[PDB]
Amino acid sequence: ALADISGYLDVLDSVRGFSYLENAREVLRSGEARCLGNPRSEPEYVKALYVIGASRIPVGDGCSHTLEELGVFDISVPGEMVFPSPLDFFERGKPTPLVRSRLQLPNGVRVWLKLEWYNPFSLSVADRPAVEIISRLSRRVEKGSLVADATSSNFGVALSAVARLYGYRARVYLPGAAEEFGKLLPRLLGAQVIVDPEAPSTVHLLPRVMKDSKNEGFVHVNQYYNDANFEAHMRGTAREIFVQSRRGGLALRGVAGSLGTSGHMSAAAFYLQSVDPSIRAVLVQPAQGDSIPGIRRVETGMLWINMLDISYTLAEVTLEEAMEAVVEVARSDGLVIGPSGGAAVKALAKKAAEGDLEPGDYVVVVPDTGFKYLSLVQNALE
């Protein structure tokens, strides 16, 4: 019989490396987890279960339990949408909406958009890694210390709100070309903001962040390499697409999305593909020469999408093409999705047009809201 996982989460602080995901994939493939003779002597297996989304764990002799029995499918949300705190709302106010699009794509590819602007701090996907990283920091690092990172915009905004709800000071480093909401809103949120107008990308800032961290002794949370990014997406974003697709009665044939740290799509793909390895992952390549906010080309360096055993496909997409998918989704659905969203929609549309895709439902992860990108919106129209 079962035990609340929340008493066992010291395994987050102690387990290392990716060998535990084997456990994660077999539990997802089989549909069950075998009973832990000693729960504390299998800290890997407990971490596989956290990661996939269990609220409970099987303890003692023999009895294997299903995914449902472990809490993967438990409803977190209160019917009435009342929450005692903004962090309780982040955590229990899930899943984000999965919304079937009116947008018509060729060869029977049915589009569902998963709306990641429904996260309360940055109105973006990047609330999830920021809550998980700052949560895990909270055991080891003293309140009032400074946490910092490089961002395209969204993670710093999230990092800033979250560090503050956990009693930490925050500093965010942006490239000059970053959107204005990423430069301004950390400050509103009580953080320090450094902008480098020469730094042509956001990863080019990391050597400075790392140098500064050495001198000034702040905590570089480094979303690019920190496994609590991938983990936050595994138990939120990915588990959600699984549970929603099942519970929605979807013929889930694939996922489409976009790549910054690679956290969210790495998890989406790895998770779902543990369940059914034929589920496709369609991934945006920002066409060379172009900048699509928040995202980049794979070969500029992304951890999880290269180290984990994930099957994916790329589809190159230009800024112009992305903003064109933003316009189309707006006129089809009345939903105003941001640039990286419309790149993912487009990449899905490119592959369906090629006849590569098995007819059925595909879930596009929409990282944020287009209200944050008016300049780009205005250029797309003129």
> Looking up tokens 């138990």, which residue turns up?
235
- SS3 letters across 70-107: HCCCCCCCCCCCCCCCHHHHHHHCCCCCEEECCCCCCC
Smallest distance from ligand E1U to CB 49, Å: 23
Q: Which stretch binds ligand E1U (CB under 6 A): 2-10, 44-52, 211-219, 258-266?
A: 258-266
Give least dist CB 4 to ligand E1U, A.
29
Task: Please choose, from the candidates 339, 334, 351, the residue with its C-alpha nearest in 3D space to the C-alpha of residue 377.
Answer: 339
Give residue number: closest CB to ligand E1U. 294
Is 119 a residue that touches ligand E1U (CB under 6 A)? no
215 is in an annotated binding site: no
Cis ω on the peptide bond leading into residue 359 (within 30° of 0)? no
CA distances 119 to 11, 55, 114, 150, 157, Å, are 27, 21, 12, 20, 12
For residue 299, how far is the Cα from the chain centroid?
20
Residue 369 interacts with ligand E1U (CB under 6 A): yes or no: no
Partners of 148 in the beta sheet? 171, 220
Amino acid at 305: I
Least Å distance, CB 305 to ligand E1U, is 8
Q: Is residue 7 a known part of a binding site?
A: no
* Candidate list 112, 121, 155, 218; residue touching ligand E1U; CB under 6 A: 155
Residue 263 counted as an annotated binding residue = yes
Any contact of residue 202 with ligand E1U (CB under 6 A)? Answer: yes
Among 262, 273, 285, 369, binds ligand E1U (CB under 6 A): 262
Q: Which sign does the torsion angle of CA 49, 54, 60, 61 carry?
A: negative
Instruction: For tokens 């999305």, name the residue.
Output: 257
- Binding of residue 96 to ligand E1U (CB under 6 A): no
Residue 213 as a binder of ligand E1U (CB under 6 A): the answer is no
Can residue 131 be called a binding residue for ligand E1U (CB under 6 A)? no
Q: Which residues are annotated as a binding site for pyridoxal 5'-phosphate?
A: 154, 260-264, 340
By CB under 6 A, name the binding residues for ligand E1U.
Answer: 124-126, 151-155, 202-203, 258-264, 293-296, 338, 340, 367-368
